[PDB]
Amino acid sequence: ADLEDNMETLNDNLKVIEKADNAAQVKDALTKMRAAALDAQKATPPKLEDKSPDSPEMWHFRHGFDILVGQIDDALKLANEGKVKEAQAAAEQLKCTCNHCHQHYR
Amino acid sequence: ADLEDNMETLNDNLKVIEKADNAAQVKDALTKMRAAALDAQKATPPKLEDKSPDSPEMWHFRHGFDILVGQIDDALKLANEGKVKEAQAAAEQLKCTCNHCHQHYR
Ligand code: HEC
Ligand code: HEC
Ligand SMILES: [Zn+2]
Ligand SMILES: [Zn+2]
Ligand SMILES: [Zn+2]
Numbered sequence: 001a002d003l004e005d006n007m008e009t010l011n012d013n014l015k016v017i018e019k020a021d022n023a024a025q026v027k028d029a030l031t032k033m034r035a036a037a038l039d040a041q042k043a044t045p046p047k048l049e050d051k052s053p054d055s056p057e058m059w060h061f062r063h064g065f066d067i068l069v070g071q072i073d074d075a076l077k078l079a080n081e082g083k084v085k086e087a088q089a090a091a092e093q094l095k096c097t098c099n100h101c102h103q104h105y106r
Numbered sequence: 107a108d109l110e111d112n113m114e115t116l117n118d119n120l121k122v123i124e125k126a127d128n129a130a131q132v133k134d135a136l137t138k139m140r141a142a143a144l145d146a147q148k149a150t151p152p153k154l155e156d157k158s159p160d161s162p163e164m165w166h167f168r169h170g171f172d173i174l175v176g177q178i179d180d181a182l183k184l185a186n187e188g189k190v191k192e193a194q195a196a197a198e199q200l201k202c203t204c205n206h207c208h209q210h211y212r
């Protein structure tokens with residue numbers, strides 16, 4: 001999967017969570033988001049001209065996905081506890097993480 | 107001013123912008139936010155145990171304020187053009203920057 005595919009996986013599954021009815025649907029979507037975040041963490045932002053892995057902005061790019069994965073894991077803990085409404089609310093807190101990286105690299 | 111004061115300056119002036127009527131009110135509030143962001147950039151997050159300036163998470167902390175200042179400057183460009191509704195909307199885009207740093211360090 002490429003960056004576009006991983007982002008649409010994140011995008012579609014965030015919606016699945018919002019519309020979900022049980023913990024299993026939420027857990028399934030969060031698990032898919034988690035893998036897509038770690039896969040996208042291997043890419044580079046197309047508009048960053050310096051793609052060097054050790055550059056500060058590439059550190060920051062990968063770091064943003066570690067933060068996102070941490071928040072996904074927080075939501076998964078709630079989903080695995082059966083707390084559906086709570087997990088859905090935690091998934092909503094992802095969105096500023098998405099929007100922050102987008103503003104900063106797009 | 108300390109970190110609490112700078113954050114409440116950011117907090118109060120974001121509200122002033124939302125309720126403003128002309129470019130001058132928006133510009134005045136954004137200018138105050140800008141100075142408070144650069145002042146807060148000198149502090150450290152109270153819950154970060156490693157306060158070393160050269161550590162990655164202290165780099166990230168200061169970097170978040172540079173991003174915020176950049177967005178404030180984008181909003182100021184619109185305010186200085188007289189585009190009040192546009193400037194107010196740009197100020198709204200700050201909020202995920204605020205919430206991102208809060209989630210990550212509080
Ligand atoms: C959090 C849950 C999300 C969600 C829902 C999305 N992202 Fe990202 N994203 C990043 C970059 C560099 C791009 C540009 C990619 C490119 O130019 O091809 C994107 C793009 C998107 C899209 C748009 C896809 C398109 O049709 O153009 C969407 C829908 C999307 N993302 C969803 C980088 C990042 C991150 C780096 C740290 C993080 C985190 C996210 N995105 C988070 C999310
Ligand atoms: C963007 C416009 C904002 C706004 C409106 C606020 N912040 Fe921050 N903030 C940061 C840290 C580390 C703290 C904890 C401070 C502490 O423990 O004393 C805060 C706290 C706040 C508050 C709460 C004040 C209180 O009564 O406890 C408020 C209202 C607030 N902030 C507003 C760190 C950062 C950032 C670092 C990169 C950025 C950016 C912001 N905050 C952005 C904003
Ligand atoms: Zn797409
Ligand atoms: Zn960066
Ligand atoms: Zn960051």
Ligand SMILES: [Zn+2]
Nearest residue numbers: 110111113114
């Ligand atoms: Zn306060």
Ligand SMILES: [Zn+2]
Nearest residue numbers: 063163166210
């Ligand atoms: Zn960090």
